[PDB]
Amino acid sequence: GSLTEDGLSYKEKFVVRSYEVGSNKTATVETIANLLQEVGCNHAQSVGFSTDGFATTTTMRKLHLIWVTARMHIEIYKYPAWGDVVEIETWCQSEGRIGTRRDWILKDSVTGEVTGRATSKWVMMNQDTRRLQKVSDDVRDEYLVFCPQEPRLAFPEENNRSLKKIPKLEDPAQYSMIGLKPRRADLDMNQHVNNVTYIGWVLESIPQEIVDTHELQVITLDYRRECQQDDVVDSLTTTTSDSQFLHLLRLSGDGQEINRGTTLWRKK
Amino acid sequence: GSLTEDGLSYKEKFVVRSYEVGSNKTATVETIANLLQEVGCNHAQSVGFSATTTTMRKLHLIWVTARMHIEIYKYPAWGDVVEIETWCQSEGRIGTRRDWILKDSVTGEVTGRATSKWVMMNQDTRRLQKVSDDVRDEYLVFCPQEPRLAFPEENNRSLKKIPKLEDPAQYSMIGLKPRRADLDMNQHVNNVTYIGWVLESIPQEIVDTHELQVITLDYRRECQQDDVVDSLTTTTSNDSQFLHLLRLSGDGQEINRGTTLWRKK
Numbered sequence: 001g002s003l004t005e006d007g008l009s010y011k012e013k014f015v016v017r018s019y020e021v022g023s024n025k026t027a028t029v030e031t032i033a034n035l036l037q038e039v040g041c042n043h044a045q046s047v048g049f050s051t052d053g054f055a056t057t058t059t060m061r062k063l064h065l066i067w068v069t070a071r072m073h074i075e076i077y078k079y080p081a082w083g084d085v086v087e088i089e090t091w092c093q094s095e096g097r098i099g100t101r102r103d104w105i106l107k108d109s110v111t112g113e114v115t116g117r118a119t120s121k122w123v124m125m126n127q128d129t130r131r132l133q134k135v136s137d138d139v140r141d142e143y144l145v146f147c148p149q150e151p152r153l154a155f156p157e158e159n160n161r162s163l164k165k166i167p168k169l170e171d172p173a174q175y176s177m178i179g180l181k182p183r184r185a186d187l188d189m190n191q192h193v194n195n196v197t198y199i200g201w202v203l204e205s206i207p208q209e210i211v212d213t214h215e216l217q218v219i220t221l222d223y224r225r226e227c228q229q230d231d232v233v234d235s236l237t238t239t240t241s242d243s244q245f246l247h248l249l250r251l252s253g254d255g256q257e258i259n260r261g262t263t264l265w266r267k268k
Numbered sequence: 269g270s271l272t273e274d275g276l277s278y279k280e281k282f283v284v285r286s287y288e289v290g291s292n293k294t295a296t297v298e299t300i301a302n303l304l305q306e307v308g309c310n311h312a313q314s315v316g317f318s319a320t321t322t323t324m325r326k327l328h329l330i331w332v333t334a335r336m337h338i339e340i341y342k343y344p345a346w347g348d349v350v351e352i353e354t355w356c357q358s359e360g361r362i363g364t365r366r367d368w369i370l371k372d373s374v375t376g377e378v379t380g381r382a383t384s385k386w387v388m389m390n391q392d393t394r395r396l397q398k399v400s401d402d403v404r405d406e407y408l409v410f411c412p413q414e415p416r417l418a419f420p421e422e423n424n425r426s427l428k429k430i431p432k433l434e435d436p437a438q439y440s441m442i443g444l445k446p447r448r449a450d451l452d453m454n455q456h457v458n459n460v461t462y463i464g465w466v467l468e469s470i471p472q473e474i475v476d477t478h479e480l481q482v483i484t485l486d487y488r489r490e491c492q493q494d495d496v497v498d499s500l501t502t503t504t505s506n507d508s509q510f511l512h513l514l515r516l517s518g519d520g521q522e523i524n525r526g527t528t529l530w531r532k533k
């Protein structure tokens with residue numbers, strides 16, 4: 001892993017592991033998402049951000065602020081096979097006072113061909129009160145020294161999938177997976193549920209026949225509220241159509257929304 | 269990853285990842301177990317498997333784990349490089365054994381060791397069997413001929429018999445179910461998932477004040493993709509020891525039994 005020549009992006013290579021692949025002998029979308037998180041953490045560490053689970057700046061630590069994901073959007077053209085080397089390039093950009101964006105490009109190391117891309121929106125939050133905040137001018141200055149000044153987007157197209165509004169699934173759902181609970185392997189070093197665990201929970205309500213005959217092309221996921229270590233989740237899915245689905249994760253009891261999303265699947 | 273000079277063992281280095289560590293910023297025992305499985309698969313691939321032999325594919329036979337025993341002295345921190353050496357040995361007609369040594373890449377010090385017992389099973393009927401002469405000959409060309417053990421000691425923990433936990437358990441975690449991330453490429457529950465499920469019934473106060481030193485796990489029956497498991501734990505003991513049982517949520521059919529040893533941080 002290393003910062004590129006100009007120091008405004010980071011690259012890292014990964015050899016796809018035996019336990020990281022699904023029935024097709026290629027990396028799962030959850031393996032891909034963990035690799036994106038890993039290269040994001042290595043980029044933050046390389047530019048001097050805190051190494052205590054929260055990649056905060058000096059001003060964020062002074063005001064007890066943390067970055068939290070609001071949206072994850074991933075598009076895969078080719079999933080790497082077991083033993084293949086995938087190269088991932090990541091960079092960050094400020095989006096005024098709204099928040100920040102982290103983008104990724106995935107490539108086949110042998111051919112140099114782009115096999116996937118991802119983008120994520122992050123918002124400022126006070127870690128004590130859990131109240132969302134706008135980005136201050138001081139933290140905007142700290143981010144600017146490590147981000148490209150001219151816009152660089154993994155998804156540049158005007159009016160693209162990564163920016164589409166997601167509706168709320170209405171009961172009854174076509175499919176559901178009930179009583180999903182996180183175990184210790186689903187938590188991060190700060191004992192919060194890993195962002196990738198939610199992708200797995202969304203996918204749990206897709207019928208096995210869809211997973212067996214189709215490959216996942218796009219996933220867009222909104223994060224609304226965190227699932228606590230002792231919470232229980234229900235994963236709901238309805239076909240909206242290629243095959244397209246609308247998704248909802250909500251707490252098992254009162255039905256409080258935690259995530260909403262969409263997936264696009266191509267026939268194998 | 270590469271076979272050593274003599275071609276009778278395999279070594280591989282791993283950089284510990286951000287999502288692979290627990291509350292102490294060091295690798296979880298499940299991360300360690302996945303790394304052992306990864307270096308085991310890379311060793312089998314390097315010596316020509318795919319992991320079955322030519323005779324096993326002819327008779328529809330597969331290797332299945334019977335026991336996993338891991339002892340960790342120091343868990344590697346996030347960003348650290350851990351080197352793992354693995355090798356196999358035939359145990360006559362009983363089955364085979366895969367052993368591992370974990371080292372700190374910087375210091376060269378042994379930070380952990382593991383051993384596992386594997387048995388032959390017909391893939392179709394699920395019936396266990398002894399290792400045939402032909403299989404034993406194929407394994408011998410890739411295994412050391414003089415005994416090499418990760419756990420050589422006279423009365424070592426890796427060979428102790430494990431009793432069955434009697435109801436009522438002191439602690440329990442009920443209704444554990446596998447998700448797609450818990451399955452392997454053949455849609456069977458990953459052996460490491462069972463270690464996680466065992467550990468689920470340990471109180472969070474023990475995990476917060478103690479470090480896991482040893483875990484011995486017997487595998488009795490497979491958890492299917494649509495099965496539900498209950499994880500049971502009873503204290504048997506400055507060290508803390510526990511007896512463990514995983515059983516199907518409905519009829520109470522045993523799937524695993526084990527023991528863990530924890531030392532105060």
Ligand SMILES: Cc1cc(C(=O)NC[C@@H]2CCOC2)on1
Nearest residue numbers: 033036037040041044055195196
């Ligand atoms: C999926 C996925 C990807 C990420 C990610 O990049 N997290 C690490 C960043 C380092 C700077 O703070 C956040 O998280 N979930």
Ligand SMILES: Cc1cc(C(=O)NC[C@@H]2CCOC2)on1
Nearest residue numbers: 301304305308309312319366459
């Ligand atoms: C834990 C744990 C460790 C292993 C392991 O070594 N798997 C690879 C073997 C060698 C090739 O056949 C199987 O599996 N589960």
